[PDB]
Amino acid sequence: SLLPVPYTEAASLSTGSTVTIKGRPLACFLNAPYLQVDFHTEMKEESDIVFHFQVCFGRRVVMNSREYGAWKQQVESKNMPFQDGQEFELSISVLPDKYQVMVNGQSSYTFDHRIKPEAVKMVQVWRDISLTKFNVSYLKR
Amino acid sequence: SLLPVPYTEAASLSTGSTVTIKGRPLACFLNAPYLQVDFHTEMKEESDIVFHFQVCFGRRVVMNSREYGAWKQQVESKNMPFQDGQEFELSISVLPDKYQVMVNGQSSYTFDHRIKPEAVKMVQVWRDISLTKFNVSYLKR
Numbered sequence A, B: 001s002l003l004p005v006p007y008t009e010a011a012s013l014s015t016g017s018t019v020t021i022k023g024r025p026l027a028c029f030l031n032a033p034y035l036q037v038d039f040h041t042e043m044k045e046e047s048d049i050v051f052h053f054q055v056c057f058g059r060r061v062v063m064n065s066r067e068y069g070a071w072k073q074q075v076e077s078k079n080m081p082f083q084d085g086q087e088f089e090l091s092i093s094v095l096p097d098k099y100q101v102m103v104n105g106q107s108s109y110t111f112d113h114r115i116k117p118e119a120v121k122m123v124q125v126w127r128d129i130s131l132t133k134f135n136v137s138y139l140k141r
């Protein structure tokens, strides 16, 4: 739709930051579209990933980190609040101990910090979605 | 780039048809982009898939068919002629007994017919690529 995908925005994160994403899958769930949100340590796409969030719509969610080029311990979830054929609202909050992912207002995943959020310099949103809104909040000290 | 992705074209296939696709992955191989080519029995995306061709760039290729709504026997290949960061040329030939997939001029995969190619009514090309060329040939009787 309106925002380019893959979507890249230079970003900084700290405790209390919220990343808000509104979008829609590009295919019915039967065809297994993906969504991926990566919090990167540099603007280069090859850079480390502090928080990797990958939705296989209708099937599972995978979370991990890529640290000095290597993927670490995968977290796999079958929780699937996303609805077939529907627009979704995604909110990722930077809490002191973890990321908290809200989906359409509902707490849906959390992921403990493995690298401090201050290491983030870029956010990329990509795979089989269109996007109409992306925001990183910058209200807190 | 130039062609919309997901890309959909109404299509007919028979022995001797060639589907030609030129495109580029939207991410470096380290970030595991996908490419998917589906030969559908109807224009609806939910319709059966006579030939499903799914590249996880740098890792593997999966082929299958979706018949009366159900995925059948997966074929998994580690053959990976696609090159990191490069444009690719993909040619899918409809031979009497199988599809033959050429990648950059090189025979790279084949998949025996499970449903007659005459059942195809649509081709979709999607996931993490841009496309500059798509053609279905219509030269043969």
Ligand SMILES: OC[C@H]1O[C@@H](O[C@H]2[C@H](O)[C@@H](O)[C@H](O)O[C@@H]2CO)[C@H](O)[C@@H](O)[C@H]1O
Residues within 6 Å of the ligand: A052, A054, A062, A063, A064, A070, A071, A073, A074, A075, B030, B031, B032
């Ligand atoms: O875990 C998320 C991450 O997986 C990558 O693949 C990892 C995989 O997680 C792990 O189980 C294996 O031992 O190593 C793989 C590669 O280092 C994928 O590249 C990726 O897209 C992510 O989803």
Ligand SMILES: OC[C@H]1O[C@@H](O[C@H]2[C@H](O)[C@@H](O)[C@H](O)O[C@@H]2CO)[C@H](O)[C@@H](O)[C@H]1O
Residues within 6 Å of the ligand: A030, A031, A032, B052, B054, B062, B063, B064, B070, B071, B073, B074, B075
């Ligand atoms: O095989 C290609 C096809 O897999 C689908 O998932 C299948 C899977 O192949 C099979 O091993 C399992 O037993 O059933 C699954 C669902 O019916 C995926 O949906 C897909 O994207 C394809 O890659």
